Structures are given as C-alpha cells and as structure tokens.
C-alpha cells in the first residue's frame, strides 16, 4: 500500500549505489501456490 510503498522508495533512494535494483512483490509466505508462482515469476520473463 501507500505507506510501505513510500517506505521502500525512500529506502532505495537513501541506500542505493552503483547499479542496484530493488523489485518488490506482494506474496504470502504461507501458500505453496504463491511460492510456486513466485519462483515461476523469478524464472521466466514477464512481458506485458
């Protein structure tokens, strides 16, 4: 949401350096469906 989005954005703009990138996803860590979808997302690409 808005609070956490502002938090992670200020975290990046404070502590970032050379070629650093931060990706941010919403995933429940108590669901095997979410763990499988998360590893598929980190695996194959996403082209919208």
């Amino acid at each position: 949401d808005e609070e956490r989005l502002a938090f992670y954005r200020t975290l990046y703009r404070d502590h970032a350096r050379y070629g650093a990138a931060l990706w941010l996803v919403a995933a429940n860590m108590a669901s095997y469906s979410d763990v499988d979808a998360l590893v598929e997302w980190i695996g194959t690409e996403q082209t919208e």
């Binding site: 992670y8 970032a16 990138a21 931060l22 990706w23 429940n28 669901s31």
Partner: protein
Amino acid sequence: ELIDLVTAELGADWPRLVAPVFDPKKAVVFDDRWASAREDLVKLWLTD
C-alpha cells in the same frame, strides 16, 4: 461437512490465513538512481 471438517482439523480462519495474494501485475521496480542523484546534488547546495 467439508468446511466443518477443516474447522475441526485445522482452524476456523484457515482459508483467510492461507489465501493466495500474489499477482504479477502488481510488481514494483525501483531502478532509478540517476534522477535521485541529480536531486541530491541540488539539495546539497540547499543545505548550509
């Protein structure tokens, strides 16, 4: 029968504790450093 089976075995709030959250359209990328670098160059001039 199935829902009070799950209520007796696991818990009453099991589907909301286990419900999937992940969706690949909501991923957020934070890889802008040159722009925040230029703005930080400005506010270094503004600070005394």
